Write an enzyme that holds these catalytic residues in place. Structure first.
Site, short mmCIF file in Angstrom:
data_model
loop_
_atom_site.label_atom_id
_atom_site.label_comp_id
_atom_site.label_asym_id
_atom_site.label_seq_id
_atom_site.Cartn_x
_atom_site.Cartn_y
_atom_site.Cartn_z
N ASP A 76 0.83 -1.21 0.00
CA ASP A 76 0.00 0.00 0.00
C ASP A 76 0.86 1.27 0.00
OD1 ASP A 76 -2.05 -1.98 0.58
OD2 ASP A 76 -1.47 -1.82 2.69
N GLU A 129 -11.40 -1.37 -2.94
CA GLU A 129 -10.76 -0.54 -1.92
C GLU A 129 -9.59 0.22 -2.53
OE1 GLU A 129 -9.37 -3.44 0.92
OE2 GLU A 129 -7.76 -4.17 -0.38
N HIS A 189 -3.47 -1.65 -4.74
CA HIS A 189 -3.28 -0.50 -3.86
C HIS A 189 -2.26 0.45 -4.50
CE1 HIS A 189 -4.49 0.70 0.30
NE2 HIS A 189 -3.79 1.73 -0.14
CA CA Z 1 -3.68 4.44 -1.01
#
Ligand code: CA
EC number: 3.2.1.99
Length: 312
Positions: free
Chosen positions: A26, A200, A270
């Site tokens: 991430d 996400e 991500h």
């Molecule tokens: Ca991010």
């Protein structure tokens, strides 16, 4: 862009054969002077630095320990790993957002920290704890993790975030506090429209008149069994409606797959997107099939076709 400055660099020209400490999950990147910085998931938010953006080395972390106030929001949290940080530079101040949560649960809170410089060798270097930004509890239908700030063409800052539950959220920020504006409403802009709502890690960038929403589909965090994928959609208005290259609404599973991985790099996801002139880079992590599925940093040039859609 002014809040993600990279100076005059032709991303398409440099050789992105990364070397060094590449364990990352991430990620986001920032550049100050001639040094590059990666912030990512890990204890107190992990930091990496590079003299050229290619050769990377661990530099430490933002917080020596979990900021005290976080414990009130996530009582169950028994370790110091903060996730999915995001960074932007505004009014001479670096705003670093981060996630406090526990896996598969939505009792989470996004925090904010600021600094005037990213160079730890500078005596003025100091990450200041600015407290809670936005949070979610078991009774909310969204998850307060995976922040990303972007400024619309009107110069107004917005915060997108989210993971599973109802999907990707968006809310207007106040320029002074860089936190949700008092009268700002929480909007839902993307969802698989399916369960589990495997979407996400939102990241928004403006490019030639359109706001592009990059998100990650499916499952991360499973090593070589990961099915993570990078998808993208766009809208003329930052609040949507976002649609993919095919015209499918991102609120109904829409999203053009930019990368689903290969035999070596599994579950890429991500991501972050940064520009320099017309050039750009896609930043993300992938699970290394040759190295026991270890999360690895990836930086690659990102091109844009005639219609304005990105490709690797
Ligand atoms: Ca991010």
């Amino acid at each position: 862009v002014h809040f993600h400055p990279f100076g005059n660099v032709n991303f398409y020209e440099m050789d992105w054969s990364l070397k060094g400490d590449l364990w990352a999950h991430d990620p986001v990147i920032a550049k100050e002077g001639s040094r590059w910085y990666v912030f990512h998931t890990g204890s107190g938010i992990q930091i990496k630095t590079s003299e050229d953006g290619v050769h990377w080395e661990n530099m430490g972390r933002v917080f020596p320990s979990l900021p005290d106030w976080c414990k009130q929001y996530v009582p169950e949290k028994d370790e110091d790993h903060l996730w999915a940080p995001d960074i932007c530079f505004y009014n001479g101040i670096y705003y670093l957002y981060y996630s406090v949560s526990t896996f598969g649960k939505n009792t989470s809170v996004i925090g904010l920290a600021t600094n005037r410089t990213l160079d730890p060798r500078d005596p003025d270097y100091e990450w200041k704890d600015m407290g809670p930004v936005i949070h979610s509890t078991a009774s909310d239908n969204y998850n307060a993790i995976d922040p990303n700030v972007v400024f619309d063409q009107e110069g107004q800052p917005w915060l997108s975030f989210g993971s599973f539950w109802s999907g990707i959220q968006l809310i207007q920020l106040d320029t002074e506090t860089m936190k949700p504006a008092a009268q700002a409403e929480l909007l839902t802009i993307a969802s698989r429209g399916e369960e589990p709502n495997a979407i996400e890690a939102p990241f928004i960038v403006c490019r030639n008149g359109y706001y592009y929403l990059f998100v990650s589909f499916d499952f991360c965090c499973r090593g070589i069994e990961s099915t993570y994928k990078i998808a993208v959609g766009r809208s003329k208005d930052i609040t949507g409606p976002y649609v993919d290259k095919n015209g499918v609404s991102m609120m109904q599973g829409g999203g053009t797959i930019l990368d689903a991985g290969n035999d070596r790099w599994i579950g890429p996801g991500h991501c972050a997107v940064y520009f320099s002139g017309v050039s750009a880079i896609l930043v993300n992590h992938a699970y290394d099939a040759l190295k026991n599925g270890e999360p690895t940093l990836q930086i690659r040039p990102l091109y844009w076709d005639d219609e304005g859609w990105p490709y690797l």
